[model samples]
Target chain A: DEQPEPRTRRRAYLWCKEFLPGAWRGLREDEFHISVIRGGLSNMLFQCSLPDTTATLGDEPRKVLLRLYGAAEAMVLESVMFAILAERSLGPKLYGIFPQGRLEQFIPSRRLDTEELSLPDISAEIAEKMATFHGMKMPFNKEPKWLFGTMEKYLKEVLRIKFTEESRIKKLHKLLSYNLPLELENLRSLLESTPSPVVFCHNDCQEGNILLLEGRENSEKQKLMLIDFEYSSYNYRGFDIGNHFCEWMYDYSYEKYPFFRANIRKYPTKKQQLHFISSYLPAFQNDFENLSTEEKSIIKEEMLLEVNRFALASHFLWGLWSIVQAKISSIEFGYMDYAQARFDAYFHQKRKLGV
Target chain B: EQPEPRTRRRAYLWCKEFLPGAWRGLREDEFHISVIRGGLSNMLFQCSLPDTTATLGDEPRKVLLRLYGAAEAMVLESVMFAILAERSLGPKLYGIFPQGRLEQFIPSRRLDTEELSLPDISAEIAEKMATFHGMKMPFNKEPKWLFGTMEKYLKEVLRIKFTEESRIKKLHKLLSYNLPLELENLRSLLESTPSPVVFCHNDCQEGNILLLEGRENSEKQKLMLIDFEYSSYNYRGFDIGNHFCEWMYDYSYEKYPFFRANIRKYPTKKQQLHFISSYLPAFQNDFENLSTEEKSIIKEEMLLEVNRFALASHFLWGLWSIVQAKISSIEFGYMDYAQARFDAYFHQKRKLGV
Candidate 1:
């Protein structure tokens, strides 16, 4: 809940005037209240609202979520992605768009935090949404380059960091003893051969990106909405599911240099994995309930292996990305050590999964 | 192949033509000229007028005629010189154009490689660097500005190495260094030390440094710093790092190539601390205000930053030499020069474990 700077306030005032609806447009600059919304790491997000003065009904000023963009490189990609997502009204409502940033219909909902993600009911809701999310149309090529391309991009960035501390280099070099470039290729080829179904996957499906409104709707998609399309792109279904499961091990709402804590034992078990997958497979889409128990068991096990094995790719992808982020990102977190722990899990999981 | 006839004559005529405000009505043949050729680097001529010898003069009649070679974007280089000249950071500019510049010929001798390690001279240069870095110039203060130059030459080396008869191709065959991976590794290795970016004279070598003929370096007066073609906002470490590396390279070597990098001549920790202690206080302009503990905190911080970024300078010029070896028609043994630098880089890395 930090007050916006003059520059931030100035920019937001102009945009909010243009983007906010008719009744809100005439509101004076002094009346505008811009405060920090405290979630985005790379970009600054805030709320700019008004006093809904319509006397006819107990209405509210249609508040807008003002998102100031980060990274010049991401502007085109995320803006384009958000537009399409908005067109389908999926995570969607773009009230205003400009060169600097955009405004969105601020949904009155709370984002689920770390603890609630592992809860049984919440887990099932995300699983159902993920299946519906993955099945959604994405107009990309069949070849799954989004996952591998990004990993390779991050690998190059990781190798390009010009760290000038000896002890830090010693620590980093130890983590790199396994030939990172080679492992990335190994990880990529291993996943490609498995030939998991590709979709317009939200690569980062963590609790922060997932939304839970106060009240339920008939549509499960509306009940538990998905937001934040910055890292959303076409990728393998396993990468989506596996990445979500990996998110369970860390709680970001902590006061530490790394900012997040990892609980290795909290990775979902077979029963929990089965619970998600069974509901995830539609009742009528593949005739799931009609299939024989043994057949269903075989199918679920098959799907479960893909998700588990592909978790290796999920771990390795962000592991390399963390090193790149350590070099590039302004966000204060122990990214160097974070990368190490991720690799530790990646290697361990690979050995245990026998991928 | 001597350039004094046309390149030098053309240079004089052009200066007389452009800077008529200074040298008009004087016959071109009356001027006494001597060219100092540092083959791969910018060539210069000390064009002296008959009555001008630093004894009696309203203004300097002798011009340090500087000509750009085949290395840089000429306009970018000239624009930088104009900026530095305006600030009195370098020599006064008599005239400036795309090809070269008519610079104030100082009545000074260049700082010799050995002299850079001399205590006061070293400290003076350190103070000069501090002023230069701390000066608020119009530049984008982004990190790794040195890397753009590194990335530029790295790309050039990559392209030129495949062409037959190119010196780069020759070095490409001889050297086992994977330049691309090496650059990435250097970038990766130096990531932890977040040195603040400042406007840098990427080449802070002894050849570019000149000291005034009369009174020694004053704590107040600017050092006789010159050359701005490689100027940009870069990691402060690269500026300090390159200068420290220059302590080893005697560019005035009595050899065909006329450059020698004596690794044994590298500055000792005491020497570096002397220079650094001289630098940051003036650079900060408020060190006397700091507590003893705070003073050491900053002092120790700069020592590690400068030490590690010195490696960046080595790799930077290593690739630079390879490219210089290719495009430069100068008699400099740039390939051997490159080998020495790369050699120093590995050794330095091993020595520091950076």
Candidate 2:
């Protein structure tokens, strides 16, 4: 690994000094600390901090997350979405933005783990956040084009690569073992027939994107917030809800070859599904608390059926994305293995539904 | 010319956010910004804190911000500069970000050509170069430095269109006629008698060495070397040879449209001996204590080595100037510089009888 240039710390310090002004009043450049919050394959995130004199001044010291964009194109989309999210107090506040990236308010919170996201109470909170997200109106086009179209584009690109590695070739061969094109065609037709209403959906709602902020002084309840809007756009509501539930089984931090290790595929039980769906759909929110027992059962059954069908689309979308990423992405994650795992799950879900 | 990344403005703004901690609460517009001249590969700006209560703090409020140029080879430069700064041989490196860096803004003037060639000052420059060479640096030995750079330039030239077809043709003819013989001679010379490898400030032109002002003693000015963008570990003789060659040309001029171009004076035999004696490792810490015999032996060996290595400098820069002719945004005539460099290389090669 290349060591960061010594001047990087100073530049971060200077950025804080200039943009934050009053917050860094007493700190020297060396005294102002900049630590790497996350260095993922794409963005390099840093947290800049100086001494807090908020107690005396009654204004908190400014601490910010500086995001350096890995791909230049990501800046425009992320900037627009982040500004809109900040307006609603959904994501972290935006301090400032530059052409290459942006500075954001640092949230002193932890990202929810897969297990944390699966908890009924936490899941309900996430469902409520999604409900709020789906209600918001965005200025960009809300075209429903993500599911099969995106998958097919990635699939075609992945197939065009001439795989020289034997392992890659074997993986490709295995992925095609189940008459994949025919299965995808059938799945596409099924999704087109059973259409769901489109909403502004966070297309990639993995647990990593969900932040759990506990109350400041033990008197307040925990708050769930969504971050990383790179994939947020107008999409089917079922796809959003299904994709989130699909994330409950995988732990991305595992040291396995493909990095993301899947435990048992924990499809939300009927009772757990009611707990979340009641929070999501405003009409049924009163059904669980105020409606007759028989009426509540019908609402839960319909929502569960719709979400499970969309779950198939979610698996297929991510599987195809991984295949293309395996061929083209510079990220260190085991994309080939990830693609295989996603497709295998896709087939299993397809078989369970008797498709 | 390729456009600079649009993020440059943002990078400048970021500096204000980071550096104002010691400057009290100076706003962005209130800070003084001045562009430093004479950098071809980087944009240099000097940022001074406004004279307010914030500026009176214990820490320095002035810093230099350098925006990196298009060259991706800067990764190597960053590592070497860090080592050099740690050793106090170059400017103190303050901080670095992805786009650029904050450097300690030393208030000094670049050494003029006359100051560079003066007997006393030239000897002092020699001593400083020797001091850098003697100290151990973390960078790897770059035995293939000259050859690698030439090959890269050769590849780049092959891919570009030259406006002056005749000039390029002239370059091709010179390379075809001389390179084979020069390469053969260099290889044989290396095999027969190897020179000691040392860390060299590869681009030590007079512009790169600075003289600080406000010294209490007027007789002695503190000289500091800067700009290690091309620094690397290489044969010791090449560093001395390059400095000697630098004595002949002056690129600084306001009256002349193009900077003053001249090959006015090469160092005489006595001058060369004086410079080399000062540069020798034996005289590094104490130049006056050297025995006459010791000085003569060291001088004789260096004179021959420096002359031979001088050709390497000419060839390397000639190749570099040729490549820069296509890619550089600088206003100077790179084609003309390339021709002059090759002409110098041809003359030196002929003098060495290769």
Candidate 3:
């Protein structure tokens, strides 16, 4: 079924030539001699630097991340485009997005590890940097195509497959039956609800996505440059924060042990959390200022209502997702364990927020 | 700031001209003389079929519905569009959408409530007619602008003010603490999901939307219509059956009452349910045969899943909405009453579906 061997090779050669015309200009065997520098995934991260060229090209070798898109993965092209767009403002420079590929200006840095950042260090810097990244506004007009409906469907799919618990499942079923219809009705009735402005945001701010630059011993600063935009979009800003918090503060011990663990200690202490709050609140201050007096009061009232709702939803979702992960592997217990910890932390933090 | 007096009058003039453009249009004063057909809320259904002169001139009026869309009604426009498309395939004709406006259509002989069908009429004919209408598929390629995120945000706003229970509020605080960040992540991730698809159908199949035809002595059969506001790109097969069920079985009283009250009344319910199941199953066999293996499985699985999920979500959301509604009205107990009924029904239905 495959194409003739020579023809297939020629096609690949031409495809490569179209994107990398200068590859031929270099030493003929240089392409085969490509060596991977770092990264653990299937995608080989290589220095595409040509030898003996100018410092701009040859000295600071062009950093290229080469990944293969199997036939099944080819459709993921839109995903990369969306991720890049979502993180365009706050993350690493994505120089070129070739067809079925990517090119970026590699920041000279090493991947961060739990050991590298002291407990206190991880708590403060990660929380602070994350809040800052989450503050970027979403671009509503250019909203990524497969965002809302697809995600909702997938979340539903994931929940259906994973959470077999009758009680929790029943809860969702009831809402869909009696509530969704009414909610839709109410949505129609409340026609005057103000439109929300969207903003650009970095979708995944996970630890591995962050690159820590090794500065001078004491003065060394950790800079978080988000990588991985496979799952990115223009969505509610709090969701981004929740995703990272799920990663940063989620504990795998609690779900198995049945004891509450403080994942917050892994990230921000009370003092550090306040510091994050101080910086984070101001980013949204302009939005607050723009609201009419009535709008402002209503928004304040809505926020309070949402805090409880969000907690319930997030907890349910975490439990649901954890159960799903368990279907894939026992290691998935981490998600459930993490959810319980979060369940505890959620209340702790809610109290702190005065909700 | 409000518009100038001249602009206000111009707006009023536009409203009048919206439905009746030409012919012997009703004078501003003559409008009061027209017979008004009373309806639910905000709507004044009136018969104003114009004669040849009205048709010849331009404004061809027959039956018209006048309604208002003030601060709380942005969804009306999309609803009308859905109805129009759905009606394209032998559905009751729906007029063009007018926001803060009115609609005109050919008047039916009588409402189904007034006219009854003859004894010779067969229910099979109605079923066949429904199938015919259901077969005519409509493709919709439109994005749905749902407000789930907004609803979540508004709830958070409400939580911040609930300072009663330190412990409960503390849980609220944790949610608030990470909420902004969580929302940001959810937004971005959701944006990476798929876009919405469209299929035309009547959204909210209430009694008000249906019109019955035939003689007063016979068993009255109604042709369903109205409430296009909730209409959007939705699953197609959902309409006919949903409308039939809503009009026939929907009882606010039964749903409002405690769940067990009705269940106890059905003597030998097992036998009754079995009989109903036998008929309904064979009747639904047509649709089942058309479904693909994957579609069939998904249909079965998702139906059960959705039912359970709906119940659970309703319980929580109803309680939550009730809390908020209580602050605004004394009739808030209705939510609690509704919630209890829904909870029991969810349990019962889930068992039945299994």
Candidate 4:
């Protein structure tokens, strides 16, 4: 892991002092609090809070998220996405943007857990949120074969690495035994035979990226929001849905080196998947309350078949990406172990598909 | 000399970032910044806070940010500053960081050369010096050869670098012909007639003394001594001698033509006696109760002691300038300053018949 330089940290703090709002600006170093919100590996996120100066006016103290980018190039693309999201009230409000990173509105919410995502009501809300997200008329770069293109790029990067450790070499040998090139070709041919319409997708919609806001008045209560748009782009609709389902099985931690831990890979049953897909279908807008029993059954059957086949592509994309991250990423998590687990699930899911 | 990196400038920016109450809701570009001149070892900036209602309290918002030079021993300097401020002898320290400090900006003017030479102001300065000398400092009292250590450091520094042959010859002649012999004679003289060791402001020049305006009762406002970078515990005579020698030359001019352009102005016997009288009783807290005979005796003894250390001050500063000539990044001509100091040392030594 790379620790940020003291000079750089000081620079970030100074930037905040200059750009933050007037109420927050008039504070000493010890008067405010900066706490690290630790989940991201590609950027450092801090939540800063100041004493409330508008007590008579009945306003809360200002709290903002300070994100310092780890990779320079990611900042360019992420800013564009954040601007669009800001306009749509889809993500957090952007207070200030700098060359290095940005200061964003801190949302008081909890991240979604696997148990929460498994609930019928919460899962339906998430599917509806994803549908609205996919409906946005994004000007993102469109690639018909985006999943395959990304996987190929990651595979090439991974193959360029010269492993220095015997243990890493052994892991690589086992991974190569599955003949990734041949499997990729077979998967691509199958996906091409049955073309699905491409839409803007949150390509990494893991449980951690979904936030559950505190319940407020009538209909805006307990709203689920999507965040972390670093991997968001135009892609096949099925991949986004399948990718989220895949996220339900694994938990990544940074407690020690080689820091990936796996839970049981629980693929949703056909019925449960059908229930989720019916809400995800654009025709209903995830509102299944007023639909007829026959109408729900028809939509459920169609989505289950489409999403199950796309699950293979989801596993393939993330598995190859993890291998590349193992070689190049500075994050502390075990990318090698993560890649192996992803491929293991991919082959099992692919075999079940009779491919 | 090592030049301070631009990173120290960023530290000032960071200070603005962390302490918003001090900035008064103004942007960095909006804050008024002016450079304070006359410091050789640090870059001083007077940052004026804008007029606004966003301050923390009803206190002066202006602050002085000092960026420590690369060659300074920061730990030693900071500790001495903390001690002096705690005892109300120096300016109050607002905030301290690793690279620099935020000091309370005093609303006052520096004493001019003529003001420093006035009888009344000079008497007050002597009293302050005596008060400082009598204070119980926390530093360990370790006696060491001041001139010997300084000369050795300068010689080593000169040997490492090559300069103009004529310049080197002048320095070589001054160091070889009289410095060693004068240093030996002074050391022996000090050993035979011991003086009290007290805390001294080793550089008590006029520039370091500030005169505050807008007094309630009197026309002469309070005088505060500042800049403790060169302060330490040393000989009582050395402090008084070094201060008296500081009255000689003015180096504030843009064009320093030659070493002899600004001549040394020594104090007359009567003026020296008057200054010494004010200093002696201040040490014993008997300024108003001294009789004529006691005053005369104290004046005579101090006159001899100060005259002897005056030669020591010349040698000490001469050696200091030689080392500074090689390593100091300041724009002043250290070579000329060293030459003048050595010339004064030889002149003073001859008058004492040493």
Candidate 5:
């Protein structure tokens, strides 16, 4: 059904009330409003007016984005809050979940215009931000309770209910029941394989989430703040790096497949895969040395399992979800094509990895 | 986590046992086989010596593809089988479902290389095939007892389960609790909407599925049954046209925005929205005439609902799925790109329609 324009207006108004609850009644007078700044689908931007006092203090009118959680659909709100708080403690404030369903934050002082991030300086800034986010760990003294549910369990529920297509449902069931469990077990068994710390990580650490902030004397520096925290949870240390590496490597491969093929590549290659491990290991080498040999092995195994599990779980969910869309409707033709392509590609990758 | 090649080989051997049981005992005397096929994810082809009889007939020692429910993931299988069966019972045979798994007939003809039909006569054959597949009402005989479940239920499950990200989850929940139910109600309410019984030749109806035999003087046109991976039980009348349109449309708006925009330019005013609707209405005009006023109104509402649902669900499930894969692994880069592109096109189309 065509949603009425009034409903859209109401929804937007409701979104504002949650973010600025105290001033909701005066929102119209305050001149606070939501606008489609850029992008589409989940990552939406809304511009809000700060009070004159805060504006004068250099707060400026900010853009609060409502990035709809696409993958970790269940824990979107919590994840956003976690990422926001985690990043705030580590870097300049980025964003956090508003009341109900939205992400609110003061807009970046200077938003990057280009979609591409080619400059070395920009890359370096982002890397530094990522490293800082990775370095900050939530005290294990009191971890959140919701993190208890395994990815496998969450996937199983999704497979059972979300997909009407029998083929996708079966595939999901197989991945969850056989593939993921095996991968997880393998990682657990491969204990004593690597030396890394299970620190707090911005699980979904990609270039898009990293913001470049204006610094001292009109200079621009990067401060990485983890934005979406849906998939953010405590786990093996290398998980964050691996996740980002996969995103970049995959995106690069997609944007330039022939280039990827031209470059001799191997799974867990001694050179490329190790680049991430090497970069990460030194940051926490002292912590690694403190652990016993057995503990180090255990950490390695855990990291491997976590990576494999994430691979299988994520791909399976993606594949099943894609077929469901193909069979039921047609929204993002590009996205559907991309999902199917990725599902096929990931399946092969898993086979190559023997997981 | 690297799988032992030995284990994988053993599993392949075990799975192969069910296909033509006699081939199992040949051992070293049989030719060493190499499998080749398209679609990289799941294995599709298995080479083996041709049947002793075909070999005697000089059918060139060939390969046999074990078409045992390889592509029919449960959802695809049911829908595909229903649609395939709804069409003329062709070579795409549903051999047997032993132990709950299906085994299908594997045609020897490899795709792209074989001359299945004369190029000039191909379109006619396709239309005939479409007629058989798309123009029949399997439900008229008393509606299939085990009714196919509504698509919305499956979408809701996805919303409830995997939509863990806050913004995505919220939208899903919003759609599920608020918007989706209305679509379901509309679908049910429009049950009596324009109904057509056209046979549907599902799947990629390329030349490979058609088999050509005999000399020019005694030429014979025969279509063999091979793959039923995407057949389904539905109002077949629109299936062939939909597939053709999809193939013609190509790339998604999300991945290739320019391509989507260009394709939009090519569509005729009415053809833009009612390509098949205009062509097939006459064929199914009787059904339309019989519709009560209430049913006709419901049909209009349902059609509009379908357009919207199609647009949103495409984003929620299709694009999200791709984004997840891009996040997970890069092997399917095309899929990720296409997901984004298709999403772009869908939104574009929705805007135009609105």
Candidate 6:
């Protein structure tokens, strides 16, 4: 019997060569090498570099980050956001786009560790980049659809989970006792009373997503670049800053079961939060000391309250996301325990708000 | 205050400092500074001595005066030309300046585009290129020249606004291709194709290969490789491929298009094999003492190398053309030529099974 061309799982080299023709042109399969970058769910990233133990008569990239979609998903804003950011030079250079994945210019940058994220200089830089990130006119609905819309989607998925074991059933049953949906609605209502501008948000500002370009070319602007736009979208501006504040509590690099440890005491203090806000606000572009005398403190107070209240939403959102990841994600981290931790934080913040 | 008097007076003064022997006491007009018409990225003038010997004793009677055009790579070109000329691999340099240079003007003509395909001359170029590749310049040996220029040109392409009123903008829109993506793809594809890294005369086109008129046909010095402006250490495939790519182009065509390109004119397999056989590193073989069979295999291996890099030449110059279209104040239809080069690149890529 005659057979068609034998199909096989797409190898990284062939797929890279196919997608990125010019950049990796002369490199055959054996010439170049690929290294796993950061392992997570929803997207997988790898660095494909021509053996650079290695340019311009073309602005061709020598190396690239090949980002494969975890769920084989498609996006409108994600692609357009990356495309737009590349034009403004605010993000990684977009190299090639295919249906299932994309090739990003592999920037020689280091990810900020959890503790370093709180350094005054680093925090200000993040705040400036974050402020600039929020300032972008995201070509999407101005309405805050992502937070509730996604939480509701995750909640539905979480509700669909069935466990065959009695102890596991008991565990999930006790976890549901928190009543996530009503809490989501209540949080929504509480957030409505609090005034926060709706702007584009990097909903996940975990240390891993922030790339600090070392020995950066300039002293004036852009030493930091925001990457991993998976959770980036138009939403409450407060949620982005609040989520970043929440990230200061947990170090995801703990080499243990659950793989993350939190110190509630490590939460950014009022002065630290105010410093980030002053860096974030257009009216207070100077140091926090300079802003101490001005009525800009009122704006800082307004944003601080917004951040504190919206942090509850940040905790709630990830809790629901973790449960869904717990159900489906193949990463070795304990998503259920992480989900519980996020829920505990959510309740603790909600109680602090006296809501 | 008219520009031409000041220009010539300055040229007279410039020649007085470094090249005083031939034109020592001559006036600006007496220097006989007539324009020479080949350079696309440089202003070329042939400055000659009047029939009187003046103070000359076999001093270069006529010198090529090269005023640089809008090339940011002026320093590299200057240092490179000096290096090559010192080795007798390039034109003899008489004087150097910040803006331009004076070099020994040979009684020579460019190897015509048609002559490039002729068997003897093509092999001569191949032979000259072998010698060119052997010389090591004081440079970082990495092959940055081709890809680096490609990236620079791509930046210029994007930087161009191509306003609605401009014909050039319309040409850009009409071509309707993504240069950045194509540049990226070209780089990715070429990186895997291994070729030796060598100090190359990156632009090894026929126009850059001059046939010295005074030299005998049998003489080794009959051909001189000129124009090291685009020279750097690069994959030898690019220089060889770029030479093959030159076969399709005849820049001397005097018409509205100003250049002619015929894909059919690309060298045949026999022509390519002849050229590669000439370019074979005999000195390298002498040291290692490779057998005749080994030499034959290496030559064939380089044929594939030349063919692969030929695609890069199409793309490299295709990008160079658009950037020149925006930047260079020349009469050539550079944007039109770009479309042709880009078209050839895609076709050649398919033909080569890349």
Instruction: Give the higher-TM-score candidate: 4 or 5.
Output: 4
Could you tell me how far off, in angstroms, the CA of residue A273 lies in candidate 3 after the best superposition?
1.6
Candidates, DockQ: 0.01, 0.01, 0.01, 0.01, 0.01, 0.01
Candidate 2 chain B lowest-lDDT run of ten: B1-10
| TM-score, predicted candidate 1 vs. hidden true structure | 0.48
Identify the runs in model 5 with alpha carbons over 4 angstroms from their true place. Answer: A1-33, A38-44, A50-99, A109-127, A139-150, A154-196, A212-225, A252-278, A282-355, B1-354
Mind giving the per-residue lDDT tens digits that candidate 6 earns over A203-236? Answer: 8887999887878835444667788777887788
Can you write out model 1's per-residue Cα lDDT over B17-116, one digit (the tens) per residue?
Answer: 5443345445667656777664545677777667642323354567777776642244344434544555566676565444556777778777778888
Candidate 2 docking class: incorrect
> How well does each candidate superpose onto the true structure, as a TM-score?
0.48, 0.48, 0.34, 0.47, 0.35, 0.48
Kindly list the per-residue Cα lDDT of model 3 for residues A1-355, writing each as its tens digit: 1222343334333333333323322334323223445433234354443344422322222434333332222223233233323334444533333343444445676656533333455545655565455554321222332234433443565545535666546544533343333332332233223232233345555556667655522532355455665555454444444444445454323445433344566643444434433334445564645667787657645543332333333443454444445445433234445444544554565466553
Ranking by lDDT: 6, 1, 2, 4, 5, 3
Can you write out model 6's per-residue Cα lDDT over B1-354, one digit (the tens) per residue?
Answer: 122555566666667655644565667666666677545546777777777656556567778777765422443455456556545666766665556777878888888888888787877888888888876443445467788888887777776756546555656563477767777777887777789888788888887888888774663557888877667778999888888888899898888679999999999989988887777753254623677888778877778877888878987788788778777777898878988898898899899786
**Docking category for candidate 5?**
incorrect
With candidate 4 superimposed using the best TM-score fit, by how many Å does residue A164's alpha carbon deviate from the native? Answer: 2.1
Q: Name the lDDT value of residue B205 in candidate 2.
A: 77
Q: What does the lDDT read for residue B326 in candidate 2? A: 68
Cα error, candidate 5, residue B223 (Å): 88
Q: Quality of candidate 6's docking, in CAPRI categories?
A: incorrect
lDDT of 2 by residue, A1-355 (tens): 2223476577666556544434453457656667787776568888877655332243434578878766532343455456556655777766554444566788887888877776767877788778878876553334577677787787677668667899988988787676666777888787777657778898888788987675632322246778888887778888999888788767798876778887545766667777778778763243346777788778668768778788888878788788777787887788878877777777777778776
lDDT of 3 by residue, B1-354 (tens): 233355334333443443334422444433321324433344444434435424444443554444442311232232333234333422322232233333445344422311212112223223433333333111122223223423553464445444346435433433443434434543463354332223334432333333434432444343434444444443322332232222222332333331222323221323322222222333445544464774456444433332332222333333344344335332233333334444443554455552
lDDT of 1 by residue, A82-113 (tens): 64466556765666656556777788778788
Worst ten-residue run, lDDT, model 6 chain B? B70-79
Total backbone clashes of model 3? 98
lDDT of 5 by residue, A1-355 (tens): 1122344446655554433323342455335444455434444454544344433323322445544332122333243234335334553333223323344455464533222233434544544555565554331211222222444454344445555567655654554454544544454443225443455556666555655554531344533344545555545545555555445433322343222221113234433443444334444453665777787666655555555445443444444454455444433343334444545656666676665
